[PDB]
Amino acid sequence: EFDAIKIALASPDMIRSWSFGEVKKPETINYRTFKPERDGLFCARIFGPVKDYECLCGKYKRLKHRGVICEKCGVEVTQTKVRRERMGHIELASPTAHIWFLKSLPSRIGLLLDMPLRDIERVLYFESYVVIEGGMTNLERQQILTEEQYLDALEEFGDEFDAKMGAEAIQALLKSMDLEQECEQLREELNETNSETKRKKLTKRIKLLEAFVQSGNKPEWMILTVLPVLPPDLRPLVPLDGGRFATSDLNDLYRRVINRNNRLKRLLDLAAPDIIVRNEKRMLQEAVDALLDNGRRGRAITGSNKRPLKSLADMIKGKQGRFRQNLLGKRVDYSGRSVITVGPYLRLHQCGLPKKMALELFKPFIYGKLELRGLATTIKAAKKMVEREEAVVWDILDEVIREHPVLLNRAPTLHRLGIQAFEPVLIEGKAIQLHPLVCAAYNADFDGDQMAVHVPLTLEAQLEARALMMSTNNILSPANGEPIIVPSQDVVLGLYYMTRDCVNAKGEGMVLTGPKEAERLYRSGLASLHARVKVRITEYEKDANGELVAKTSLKDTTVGRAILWMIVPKGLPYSIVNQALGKKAISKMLNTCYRILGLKPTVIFADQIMYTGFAYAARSGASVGIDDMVIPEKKHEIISEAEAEVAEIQEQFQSGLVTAGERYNKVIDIWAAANDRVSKAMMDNLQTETVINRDGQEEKQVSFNSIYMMADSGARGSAAQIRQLAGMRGLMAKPDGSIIETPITANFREGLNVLQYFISTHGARKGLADTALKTANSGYLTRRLVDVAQDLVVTEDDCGTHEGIMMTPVIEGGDVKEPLRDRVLGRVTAEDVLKPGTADILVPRNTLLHEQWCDLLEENSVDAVKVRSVVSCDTDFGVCAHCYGRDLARGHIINKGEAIGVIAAQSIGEPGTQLTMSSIQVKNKGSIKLSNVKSVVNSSGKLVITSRNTELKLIDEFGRTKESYKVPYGAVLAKGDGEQVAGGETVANWDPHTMPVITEVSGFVRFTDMIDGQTITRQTDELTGLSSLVVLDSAERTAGGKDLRPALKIVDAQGNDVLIPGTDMPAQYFLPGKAIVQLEDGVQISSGDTLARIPQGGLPRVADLFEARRPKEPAILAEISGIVSFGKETKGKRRLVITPDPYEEMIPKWRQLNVFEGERVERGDVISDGPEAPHDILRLRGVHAVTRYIVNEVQDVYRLQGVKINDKHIEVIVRQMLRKATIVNAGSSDFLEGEQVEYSRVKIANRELEANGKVGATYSRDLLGITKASLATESFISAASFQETTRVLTEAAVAGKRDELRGLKENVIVGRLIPAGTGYAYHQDRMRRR
Amino acid sequence: GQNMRVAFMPWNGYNFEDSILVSERVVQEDRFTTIHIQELACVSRDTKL
Amino acid sequence: ARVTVQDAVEKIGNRFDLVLVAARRARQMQVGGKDPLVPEENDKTTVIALREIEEGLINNQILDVRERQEQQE
Amino acid sequence: DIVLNPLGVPSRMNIGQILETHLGMAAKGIGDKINAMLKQQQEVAKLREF
Amino acid sequence: EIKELLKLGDLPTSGQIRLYDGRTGEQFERPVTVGYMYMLKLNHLVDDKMHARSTGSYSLVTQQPLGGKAQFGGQRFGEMEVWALEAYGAAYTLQEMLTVKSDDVNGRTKMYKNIVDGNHQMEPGMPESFNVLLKEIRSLGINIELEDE
DNA sequence: GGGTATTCGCCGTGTACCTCTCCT
RNA sequence: CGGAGAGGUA
DNA sequence: CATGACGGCGAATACCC
């Protein structure tokens, strides 16, 4: 019955209109009786009867009497629930200033009246006067007359001026001032200046004035005169120990306000000395501002205990506030919880549910069915029957839950698979039985975990459980598209053991008719499970038509592999099981089954795999014993050799050969080498066993050691843990992070000594505390991401945009971190991907690149692919299916109405707790390409780079670049371009501790504009003795040298100047003042030498990247493109100018600048090194560049830990970060110039203007942090429910904001259907009807 | 606690993810049966009536 | 339909649209007194609706047409 | 009496539970001998020796 | 020393013995570590933890169910559970968690009556906690109201 | 009178569940 | 049946 | 009274012209 939520200020008349009566007495209820005192906080005549349809007096006690107001006691005969809907009012003797509109920064009263907050506070809390109406005297309106000044001013002249004190003065000021006239005055003041800070202040004030003008709110309304009173049933009194009440903590503040108001009013009637009147007025102000926001200004009023009082503002803000505790989440009926145990017999869609729990949960359904067959005439009979737990009631329970799913949830719900739907199977126990394969989805185990169960009530909820949340539909991960039901532990161990082969196992050399004969031989004990045999295998393969063609052949395999083949669905190659099967192999098997055959065979195959793995892990008898931790026989020798080596290098320190620092550095290296040797010996001894062949020969084979099998299969453990078990624990770190010199040479089998164990406790405690404290940061980041992306939903099929992001493989040095296949799988191309021949089109323009398409891409060695991205998608209020691409969880293109923003936020947040906290040598064979390069003559013929810092690519023949290396200024490449490289030889060599001012053309350098002894110094080092020159820094250097800047020109034997061809400005090189001239004057210089010396990660990093935090020392870039120069220096910071209109920027001068005095740079060229601020990247290089930067950095952090997250989620977050635009010029639109508005609004307005033929406004995209972007949303309900509820609500009330129930959070809060998923179409109807 | 004869081996998934398989003889011998004593209070007071 | 809904999903297309159509049909059978178009096998109304959908006997268009006919008498 | 998963031993690296197990067996073994000598009503000298 | 004590008891030094499968009598293929471990029963019994509720008492200020097994309370469907439901697209499940399983008094009463009548259909209304929030914001001297339609 | 660097106050800091005592 | 403090489980 | 938290950010303060 509503479409939007309206918020504004409350006028005194409106507050009176809300109330049903006035509260006058400060005593809540009569303690002698249990009736409430009349006219108090729980008065019945105002708020309603305490009982239903009964007077306070008891005269009327029937529904026939409804509607009759009792004359005796004034109480109306009505439902008692009106007590939680009827509000009161408190008449205030004096105007009181609302605390929210005063102290919530920025002060609204302060901004509106242009007064400082301190001044208003002194006046408000009775420390100063305000000249409301000076008249024609020498006193202005907002002049603060101190009490002395006030009396003396009144003495000299005390009629014309009207200086008042207290909130009544602010009332007078706010009421008198005309908004429109003074707004015009400020608007004309804005253009009548040139000071930027004054412009900022004026526009900040004018925004507040416009907010008041458009909303219809009145300034004087910010000063309260009638105080609303919450309904008493919303602030009840909880009984304790039968006869007494605790502190309500909210009625106390109301009591204090009422008391202070009455005493003020009475000390105003009898009249008193003004000082005590003002004291009473001040303490009434304090009572009201504590009732509204206790503690916001001044000390927090304290109750019976030292605990601060919880005020009205505390009702609605924070974790325990109304929004987060009762609206965004709430306790629900039809719910239970219990300890979870493993059900290994369950199918993937089933859960084990206690029958007692189900009987309690499904109780209304039991009642309904019992009445349905007339076994219980009334509700009471059915309730008694259920309480007795009759057999027929258990039959009813069996019938009800036949196909009615239940939702299982385990906290924390990090991603959506933390809630899944299952078919309940009644079990006799009290614990819930969980299917093993979904445990990884829940991050659940059976060491004490508990889960909650919920019962979908309606048909829509049941079908959403079956079709959306059921475990059979959730086999793939929405974060990366990989399967998430992968077997682990016992199943992996069983499959690995059954698929392992032995050299001389019983039954080797047999030839079997098929898998059934292998199973018969194994079960009858005639053949070992690892016997190498020949088996007739019939496999099936899909053809082009899609039918299964059968091929039968003899396979050289094992008995166990043949047995396992029986459960494999038709259509898979036999080779998929013809190997020892580890966790990786089993996951690949499941993924292949899903890709080829679809969901149903995959679910059946997963169940069969789990059953087979459990059965054969049980049959294997795999155990763990002290003998399995086989310690290498060379361990003691290696330890003694390392000890002798460290003793020798300690003897080196004794005689002074090595310093303490290097002593420790080499002791650490020596111990690391010893640890590596011990680890290698242990693994070599552990990974192999010796076996006698059928020919009596001794043969090596893969070991059947239990722990080695556990590690090799991938079921449990890693090489590192095995090294701790059977090698040595190794080097440990101090709590401060420094490595302890002496490592733990013992292992857990030998046992540590007291000192070693105490040393290891440091790291153990550090890791546990790290986890405990980082979980909170991860949760906070997840909540911020969820908010910033909550409203983003796929709302279109195709917006038709031709833009996109260019995907290439991630290359860092020699290795390629990420194949192009991974980055483009499931993406939609933004252009036709021409075959390298460039003649034809390898894939058409708009193709969802699935497995086969990427197969074609990689097979033809496609270098790069342009794909559509949610960031560049044209759709307003959402994205389109094509730009998002494949739905990773489902495997097809994303459907309309899918809440991709929440999915992206959860996908990024979930692995948050897994996060922490001089030359170039090609390594491979390929041609070398160079871009952004300038080549000139060289002394040795080997090219020197003169271009602004460039890169280098290694392309391996077929045209795919396998390597990239950065090339600084002056790096002289050791080869040419395209020469090809064997691999392992240096390509370029340079000194990272110097940088020249090289001039390509040879000649004699002439020291122009140059003074000896003022701008230069001569030094003669004792070791060398040469008269080298230091170009002293200007601030360091003498006063005389400051006026002249150093300069070095090029002249030749001809006498003229040779300069860079094509230009008009002579080749003149200034030295930056940190340069070392080693050569003498008039020395012929060959190109390719030095002319000067110029010396020179985890979860927090991801949070800083998503918050768009500016780095401490950000890289300076070229704002515009042109030739650089300097200007004023020292006068603050060095000025650099750029011109092709000129640019002028200031730079610390204790920083290093890559560019030289006459070096021309393009827009975005790095002027000074350092981490790049993403704001600058967006400003200069565009949306695409900042998106790529954020994606690359976030994926760097996540790939360091081995976490696989698709880039599209990060792109969704970036798109949410890029929702704001600042107007460069108003144009013909209605947007004011210079303000920040929504980018979609600008798009719509410009599209409409271009339809009308007018000119559209120009805008600059604004990058906002996730917190800032969340708080800057158009919906004030969402922002208030997120953070800073006081500030957001003050903004909304002053502006008079209107909130459309358009996002997910808004509809959740009002309990409507969300505009996503199954409710999406509903909202569409709601849109079309309106 | 109690001294239990224990074998380290997988048993058909019933010891998956730290789960424990317990013989019925352990239940029969009351090895881990425990006594729990709860105190319930019934207070008769004065009410207005 | 009793273990996986992929057949019904492919029949309808959008999964959410499948949920809505199945809910409409299941309400027509639970409260409207309509008879299953498929042989009831002790299934719930939701599962019966899903089974009808995966065989092409029930979709949004068919439901709309039948509703129009029924309201016409 | 109880079947425990071997797979929870390696990654946890709580190897003591293995050694205790071995030692526990040894302990029981000693009792299993003494109990036998108690059921066969052996001489106090033999029990003393063992 | 442990192996010496195992010898004294005529037990294998490896601590591993041949076990047989009770179900079939078949030999487990590898020796199994068999010994005695000293096990403890922790004060985390499933009797004290298992809990379920269909309907029950509700809180005074907000008509949402009570919390805690001792109060026969309902499970809290927090923010992250709501996020999971939104990520699934299960709009109706989320709505019934927010309204008819919660402080929607009229909706929950009608839902119970419909379930007793075999009609699994909800008629959601406005959650009561939203009305509480509206009243609380009114009490701060701020006019917040729903609009026409 | 104007710009910039420093200071100060406010905002935020994981979910779910269980037990006890004490509280105008 | 609200708040506070303490402890604990995942 | 509590005096064991700290990072980020915007408004205000002061310093430097």
Ligand SMILES: [Mg+2]
């Ligand atoms: Mg656990």
Ligand SMILES: [Zn+2]
């Ligand atoms: Zn009356």
Ligand SMILES: [Zn+2]
């Ligand atoms: Zn698009």
